[PDB]
Amino acid sequence: AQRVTFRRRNPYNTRSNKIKVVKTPGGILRAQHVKKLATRPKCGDCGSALQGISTLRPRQYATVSKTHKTVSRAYGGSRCANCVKERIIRAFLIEEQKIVKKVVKEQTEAAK
Amino acid sequence: GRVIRNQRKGAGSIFTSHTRLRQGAAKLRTLDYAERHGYIRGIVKQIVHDSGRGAPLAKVVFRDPYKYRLREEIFIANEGVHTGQFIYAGKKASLNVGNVLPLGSVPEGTIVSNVEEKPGDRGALARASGNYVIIIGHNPDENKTRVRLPSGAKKVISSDARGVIGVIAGGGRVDKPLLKAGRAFHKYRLKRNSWPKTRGVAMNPVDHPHGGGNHQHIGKASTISRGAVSGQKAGLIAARRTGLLRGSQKTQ
Amino acid sequence: AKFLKAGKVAVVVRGRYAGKKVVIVKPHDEGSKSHPFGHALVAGIERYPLKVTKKHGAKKVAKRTKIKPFIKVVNYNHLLPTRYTLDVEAFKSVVSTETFEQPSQREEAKKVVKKAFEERHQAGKNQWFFSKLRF
Amino acid sequence: AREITDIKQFLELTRRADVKTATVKINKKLNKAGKPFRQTKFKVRGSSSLYTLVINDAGKAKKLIQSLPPTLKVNRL
RNA sequence: GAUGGGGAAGCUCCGUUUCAAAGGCCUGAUUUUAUGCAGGCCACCAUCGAAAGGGAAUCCGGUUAAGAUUCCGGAACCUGGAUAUGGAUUCUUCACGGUAACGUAACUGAAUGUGGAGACGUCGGCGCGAGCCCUGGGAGGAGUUAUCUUUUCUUCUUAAC
RNA sequence: GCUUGUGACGGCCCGUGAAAAUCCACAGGAAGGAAUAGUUUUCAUGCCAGGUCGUACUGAUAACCGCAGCAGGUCUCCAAG
RNA sequence: UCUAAGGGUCGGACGAUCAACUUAGAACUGGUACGGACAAGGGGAAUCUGACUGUCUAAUUAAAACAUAGCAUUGCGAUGGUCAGAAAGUGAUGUUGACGCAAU
């Protein structure tokens, strides 16, 4: 039965004027404006939430230690482990089959 | 009387196209040495809905021949094409669905989409959900190919004009009744201010030729000379005939 | 048939050393206590040698060809077995179950594998293995 | 802001430099069994954080008050 | 909505990357100098247009006749700029560990490229949080008490970081 | 339970439901780097600065618009038994 | 005023502990009253007419008028149809292309 007010001239229930309610040490109820929630950085070749990488709003990553926004593998943020595991394989297998794609057409060159 | 509705459209205003949500515009690659002489392989990264246009788009990306970077074009997607698909473009590209070949490089029978009207214009003909053009024959008396357009008409364009093998995707969208005004509302909402439509016959004379009253009716042939002046062209425009047919085929 | 051998070269396909070339040196096909699974004692590079042009100076070349090594226990499943093969003799010794635990021993090992590898790369006996594999 | 627990690393803080003042608070708290004992908090105002060290053993506490630099403005109570 | 332009007797109309020679970012040379220059990449590119859209960062207590997320007290955070000490790194020069998902107090990185966040509809049930609502014991204060009720009311709070 | 926030799902479309500033990251390896000594400010700590304009109050059966202290009109948030 | 049924948690077909209200039934009772105030559909048979939901004459007309989905006709392959402008290196449709745009 205690009621509250926005603490900033914006009187409309928009996304940036989200509000929380807090009991203060005064023993009094008060609004407190709440920032909008962050989202998980996503993996840039499958779109999945990057494991190990922190979840701040974008400018916050400039106030954060590097360990918070990478992991220790080829493609720290960027891509997603199963996607670098696929990635290496695909590299190796093709570069191999190149050599072959190559040698095999050099054989059928002599055959002519 | 008053400027009629159909004349007010020319002025843009309330009648321009609703385009905020549109993806980019849909085009072939710009025609380069790659495509003029060989082929160039892109992948289709995503395929995507475009507001106002049933028929989905393919966002397909290619390497840049003259600079180290990637280049994304926006194709119209062609039914069967699928993310992770390689897309080959140009004179030497092989006859698979999804590729883009010069008309002059495909056999008679081949069916294609998004075909250029002049080589290099980046795609003009057969672009809407479901459509395509058929190559009927070729004529190396100047590099020309003769085709069939979705409308019925045959047209002869340059064998250098490119098409993409296959039909435009988006099925038979029109096969489903719209059912309720609201569906048309949302329909035209992503297109343009053309809906609902008041009949001229329910307007007064100031507003339209149909206009006057005492009983609703047109009072003169609704069949207008092509040379009539704007203000007067409402109805059936240079109608070579009028009335119910049951027609069944076109021009062949 | 049964390849997993003494001097097989393979690509680490997971974790930190993901993407890098190595040679198995002690196969342990059976499960270890800690390590209850098919695994292999390997040694590959961690920082490859850099490229070398005619235009390169004296000690530049001497610098552009240092090689940071590494040694790992690694699950067979985190390996891309290759058709290529590299002789394991000079390090054969330094790399055993022993050298794991006690950092210094892992350390003295790397000291040796590095001398060996840098050696191998001069007068290019065995190449390929010295290039990055790019993805 | 911060709480400190290494009674030693505390002691470096008490000299440190930027640390002109500090304070000793005393609470009449009570343990899990519930017997009135003497908790004593050592607050140290550094430039940009307030490191408060909490000592529950009354013995070691009343000792440590005589281990602060004599050139630090300890506010008592 | 200016501009190279094109119409118009003209007030001006059209056009906005447009049929245009449309820039400026690093730093070497030079240490006559902080500076003209030698490198060089990248640029179909005015601007105005949101006090409800997007967006760097603050909270609680106290205070006035009238101001307060603005003053006071205390406790923070962001941005730009300076910088030194510590720590980390290296004779295997640009860190280790973990099979792996990944871990971390850090762990050089120009051009160029590429990816992500900014970033997005509506309805429904289901799960969870917060505040609120109801409520037992107890420590206080108020109320009623001809008669009854271990009773009725009420205080028991915790901010950003 | 109420109000709100939020998640993992599901229904809907011939509707599939902005943009730019801005911030980070990866790929790349130009280049700069130690042994009597250098590298490094995406780790901790420390120094400095943060301008201009608005900021009262009403917000409606009397502070706005309807000649007015007009039974009309005028956008929103909070919500007890 | 009673009866019965519908959960949770923890110890091995029971055993301990915590916690809700809701539902069906039965007896008793009254000046036969009880959704006791508040709240809250009258129903049926037909004819004319418009399919429906939607719309308009702000201040005398809300309707059977307008819309609509559905049906049909007409023009156009871009050197184009329809429309704009005094003129233009001018403009709408058009980020379009006949499963489209335009006109009835």
Please answer yes or no on whether C18 and A74 come within 8 Å at the CB atom: yes
Residues counted in chain A = 112
Query: Which residues in chain C precede a discontinuity of more than 2.5 Å between C and N?
Result: none
Q: DSSP labels for B19-39? A: -TT--S---PPP--HHHHHS-
Q: Work out the angle at residue C109's Cα, subtended by the Cα atoms of residues C106 and C111, and round it to the nearest 5 degrees.
A: 115
The verdict on whether omega for the bond into residue A25 sits within 30 degrees of 0, i.e. cis, is: no
A96 touches chain C (CB under 8 A): yes
Q: What burial class does residue C50 get, using C-beta atoms within 10 Å of its C-beta: 0-12 exposed, 13-18 middle, 19+ buried? A: middle
In angstroms, rounded to a whole number, what is the distance separating the alpha carbons of residues B26 and B237?
32
CB atoms C11 and A92 under 8 Å: yes
**Dihedral (C-alpha) B203, B204, B205, B209: value to the nearest 10 degrees?**
10
CA atoms within a 13 Å half-sphere pointing along the CA-CB vector of D51:
18
Closest-CA residue to B17 (of B193, B196, B195):
B193
β-pair partners for B71: B62
Q: Which run of H or E residues covers position D8? A: helix D7-15
What phi-psi label fits residue A75: left (phi over 0), alpha (psi between -120 and 50 degrees) or beta? left
Chains that touch A (3 or more CB pairs under 8 A): C
Looking at the complex, does the CB of residue A100 fall below 8 Å from at least one CB of chain C? Answer: no
Closest to A88 (Cβ–Cβ): which among C16, C19, C83? C19
Q: Which of chain G's bases lie under 7 Å from a protein CB?
A: 52-54, 65-70, 72-79, 81-84, 91-104
Counting as contact any 3 or more CB pairs under 8 A, the partners of C are A
| Ordered DSSP codes for A55-103 | ---GGGGGGS-GGGG--SSSSSSSS-SHHHHHHHHHHHHHHHHHHHHHH
**Per DSSP, what are the bridge partners of residue B40?**
B89
Dist. CA D76–CA A30, nearest whole Å: 34
Chain C residues with CB inside 8 Å of A92's CB? Answer: 11, 80, 82, 133
3-class DSSP state of B115: strand
Q: Which residues contact C24 (CB under 8 A, 6 or more apart)?
A: C4, C5, C6, C7, C8, C9, C10, C40, C41, C42, C79
Length of chain D: 77
Which segments of C21-77 are extended strands (E)?
21-26, 39-47, 68-75
Residues 6+ apart with CB under 8 A from B20: none
Q: What is the spatial distance between Cα B143 and Cα B157, in angstroms, rounded to a whole number?
A: 9
Q: What are phi and psi of A25, to 5 degrees?
A: -65, -20
Of C14, C82, C133, the CB nearest to A85: C14
Dihedral pair phi/psi, residue D24, rounded to 5°: -115, 110
**CA of B21: nucleotide with nearest C1':** F18
Separation in Å, CA B234 to CA A45, B57, B197, C45? 54, 36, 13, 80
Question: Which residue, among B51, D59, D3, C84, has the nearest Cα to A92 in the 3D structure?
Answer: C84
Which residues does C104 contact at the CB level (< 8 Å), separation at least 6?
A: none
Angle at B180 between CA B174 and CA B182, to 5 degrees: 100
- Gap from A20 CA to F1 C1', Å: 21
Residue D73, Cβ neighbours under 10 Å: how many?
A: 10
Span CA (B114) to C1' (E14), Å:
33
B56 in helix, strand or coil? strand
* Per-residue tokens: B232: 């007067």
Tokens of B242: 């009028």
> B145 and B135 in contact (C-beta within 8 Å)?
yes
Q: Who's near C77: CB < 8 A, 6+ residues apart? A: C37, C38
- Which residues from A are below 8 Å from C47, CB to CB? none
Where are any strands of DSSP class E within D1-77?
Answer: 3-4, 21-27, 39-46, 49-55, 73-76
- Sheet containing strand C68-75, strands side by side: C68-75, C39-47, C21-26, C8-12, C79-85
- Work out the angle at residue B45's Cα, subtended by the Cα atoms of residues B43 and B51, and round it to the nearest 5 degrees: 130
Chain centroid to CA B89: 21
CB contact under 8 A, A91 and C134: yes
Resolution (A): 6.6
Distance, in Å, from the CA atom of B232 to the CA atom of C27, rounded to the nearest integer, reads: 92
Residue with tokens 């004992």: D37
Contact B209, B201 (CB under 8 A): no
Sign of CA dihedral C5, C11, C12, C13: negative
Q: Are B151 and B61 in contact (CB under 8 A)?
A: no
Q: How many whole angstroms separate alpha carbon D21 and alpha carbon D8?
A: 18
Structure tokens at B178: 């719209």
Q: What distances in angstroms separate CA A6 from CA A1, A32, B200, C2, one per listed residue?
A: 17, 8, 54, 73
Q: Which nucleotide's C1' atom has the smallest distance to the CA of C72?
A: E99
Count Cβ neighbours within 10 Å for each residue of B64-90 and write b for 16 or more, e otherwise: eeeeeeeeebbbbbbbebeeebebbbb
Q: Which residues contact B53 (CB under 8 A, 6 or more apart)?
A: B22, B128, B129
